[PDB]
Amino acid sequence: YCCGRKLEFSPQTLCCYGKQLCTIPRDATYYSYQNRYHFCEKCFNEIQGESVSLGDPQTTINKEQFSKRKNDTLDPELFVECTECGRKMHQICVLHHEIIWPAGFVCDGCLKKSARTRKENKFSAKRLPSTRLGTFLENRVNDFLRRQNHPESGEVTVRVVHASDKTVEVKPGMKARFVDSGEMAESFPYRTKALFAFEEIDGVDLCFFGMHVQEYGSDCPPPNQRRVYISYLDSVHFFRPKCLRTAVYHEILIGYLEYVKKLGYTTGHIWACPPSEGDDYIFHCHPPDQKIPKPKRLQEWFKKMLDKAVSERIVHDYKDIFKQATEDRLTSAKELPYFEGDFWPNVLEESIKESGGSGSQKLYATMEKHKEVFFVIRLIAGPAANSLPPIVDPDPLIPCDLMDGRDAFLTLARDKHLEFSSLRRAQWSTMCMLVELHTQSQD
Ligand SMILES: COc1ccc(C2(C(=O)N3C[C@H](F)C[C@@H]3C(=O)Nc3ccc4[nH]ncc4n3)CCCCC2)cc1
Ligand SMILES: [Zn+2]
Ligand SMILES: [Zn+2]
Ligand SMILES: [Zn+2]
């Protein structure tokens, strides 16, 4: 071997299908049917008798048709063979990708000896199509890095890899309360964008940061107009050097707020919510020693980022949702911004049901309960906010199914055994992710 290391992939967490958002973690017992429908033991034993309705229509399958197993299968890492010396090498170690170098793998010893070099990887992060937004962000990050003069830092590339039109539909409880009486729009149009930051470490790209956002333009009816909502943020903690990692995250996030403020978006919204254990927002299979922040520390992290943005004159100010509503003299749930997949649409469904039909009953109490978790970020304030021209985004749409939401990228990593759990594995996953973004765009 190369490293002389016996390497195998770790078992990944699956879903249990018999409960919304349930999972089966490493080294857990589970029941599976056709390697497709998996059940945690609890979700299995809570099924009535021996009849499970399956599908994705209904197919009643008996319970004795399942296999009982433990989630502990260890797939060995793959090797590749040098087409000349026949040396066997971990594919991840040498980062050989059949699509980048179709003519076969040639080890570095055979390359140095013959004074040869690998043909250039034209499937790099750098060569992903650029945008006004991505350029604005990466200029900000690289200018910051060069101001720091740290010998270990590498060039950072920021790329927007998806942009498409969407709408968020008001859920049935709030629909029956406010939409059917005509007090609230039934849906809100927005544009979603996915963007990623890469760092060149030793001429090798590493994806270390990802973001999905929802941008509601000047055409959106209230209460959603001229607002951006950050759907998901994620990172892989291998940015080099470690002591600039947080500042780089801040530069990206503050730069994005600066950018949308320039286009005319008045307000930013952040739900400071950690993932639960074993759940990946964007990047599949995080490093074990990269810890999920607990809520209070995630909140303070966002507070520090926003405070720097305020002192930079980018953010005017920010408040929690409870304080924001009080100053806005809010009286009804219909006045709250209604975002896709956000907490408040879900809690308002439950609030209306438990109150027997009111849409204002526990509103302020619920906002006070959770206020520390919801940031309302004022970008454009006072009289300037009233006379704004239409929002015209210079960047075009970018159709890319792999990056339409977070799910397709998690599925690709699952299907191709990609992990972001170590530097070597995250570099390999970055290479495969880059190849996929380049080939999908070719179509
Ligand atoms: C105080 O400390 C922090 C460490 C990282 C962050 C950020 C961040 O990345 N995250 C916040 C959420 F927590 C999701 C993601 C995260 O930790 N995601 C992880 C991390 C480890 C994981 N293991 N398993 C899953 C899993 N998800 C860094 C990039 C910009 C967003 C804020 C913020 C604070
Ligand atoms: Zn190796
Ligand atoms: Zn379960
Ligand atoms: Zn060789």
The answer to whether 233 is annotated as binding is: yes
Technique of determination: X-ray
Question: 85 C-alpha vs ligand 2 centroid, how far in Å?
Answer: 17
CA 205 to chain centre: 19
Atom of ligand 1 at shortest range from CA of 274? 13
Give dist(CA 305, CA 42) in Å, integer. Answer: 41
| Dihedral angle, C-alpha 92, 94, 96, 100, nearest 10 ° | 120
Q: What is the dihedral of CA 389, 390, 392, 393, to 10 degrees?
A: 100
Q: Choose among 109, 105, 342: nearest CA to 212.
A: 342
Spatial separation of the C-alpha atoms in residues 156 and 72, rounded to whole Å: 37
**H helices present in 229-340, as ranges:** 245-263, 295-311, 321-328
**Six-digit token pair at 330?**
């809010």
Tokens in use for 262? 């320039």
Distance, CA of 331 to CA of 325 (rounded, Å): 8
Query: Angle CA(86)–CA(92)–CA(94) in degrees, nearest 5?
Result: 50
Tokens in use for 349? 């469904």
Residue 427 near residue 433 (C-beta atoms within 8 A): no
> Cα angle at 206 between 142 and 430, to 5 degrees?
135
> Do 398 and 165 form a contact (C-beta atoms < 8 A)?
no
Q: Is residue 223 a contact partner of residue 337, using CB atoms and an 8 Å limit?
A: yes
Contact 58, 70 (CB under 8 A): no
Handedness of CA 282, 227, 272, 167 (dihedral sign): negative
- Which of 213, 232, 233 should be mutated for ligand 1, with most atoms under 8 A from CB? 233
By the 8 A CB rule, do 226 and 388 touch? yes
- Ligand 1 atom nearest to 287, measured from its CA: 23
What is the rounded CA–CA span in Å between residue 12 and residue 26? Answer: 6
378 known ligand binder: no
36 labelled as ligand-binding? no
Place of tokens 């006045």: 335
**Cβ contacts of 145 within 8 Å, gap of 6 or more:** 153, 156, 244, 248
Q: List all residues whose CB is within 6 A of at least one atom of ligand 1.
A: 233-235, 249, 274-275, 280-281, 286, 290, 292-293, 297-298, 301
Look at phi and psi of residue 278 and say left if phi exceeds 0, alpha if psi is from -120 to 50, else beta.
left
Give φ, ψ of 219 to 5 degrees.
Answer: -85, -15
The per-residue DSSP string of 152-181 comes to T---EEEEEEEEEEEEEEPPHHHIIIIITT
Altogether, the residues listed in the chain come to a count of: 443
Q: Which of 230, 234, 305 to mutate to test the pocket of ligand 1 (most atoms within 8 A of CB)?
A: 234
Please name the residue that has the structure tokens 């607002």: 227
How far is Cα 340 from Cα 321, in angstroms, rounded to an integer? 17
CA angle 242, 90, 435 (to 5 degrees): 70
**Number of helical H runs and strand E runs in the chain:** 12, 16
Tell me, rounded to whole angstroms, the distance of Cα 357 from its chain centroid. 35
Buried b (16+ CB within 10 A) or exposed e, 264-273: bbbbbbbbbb
Strand partners, 196: 159, 210
Question: SS3 of 431, please?
Answer: helix
Cα-Cα-Cα-Cα torsion 122, 125, 129, 132, nearest 10 degrees, comes to: -150
Phi, psi of 39 (to 5 degrees): -135, 130
Q: Helical H runs in 355-399?
A: 363-369
Residue nearest to atom 34 of ligand 1 (CA): 298
135 token code pair: 């350029």
The Å distance, Cα 21 to ligand 3 centre, comes to 8
Element (H, E) at 39: strand 37-40
Quick one: how far is CA 260 from the chain centroid? Answer: 19
- What six digits make up the tokens of 191? 């544009």
**Residue 24 contacts residue 13 (beta carbons within 8 Å):** yes
SS3 35: coil
Give every CB contact of residue 143 below 8 A, 6+ residues apart in sequence. none
Phi first, then psi, for residue 296 (nearest 5°) are -65, -35
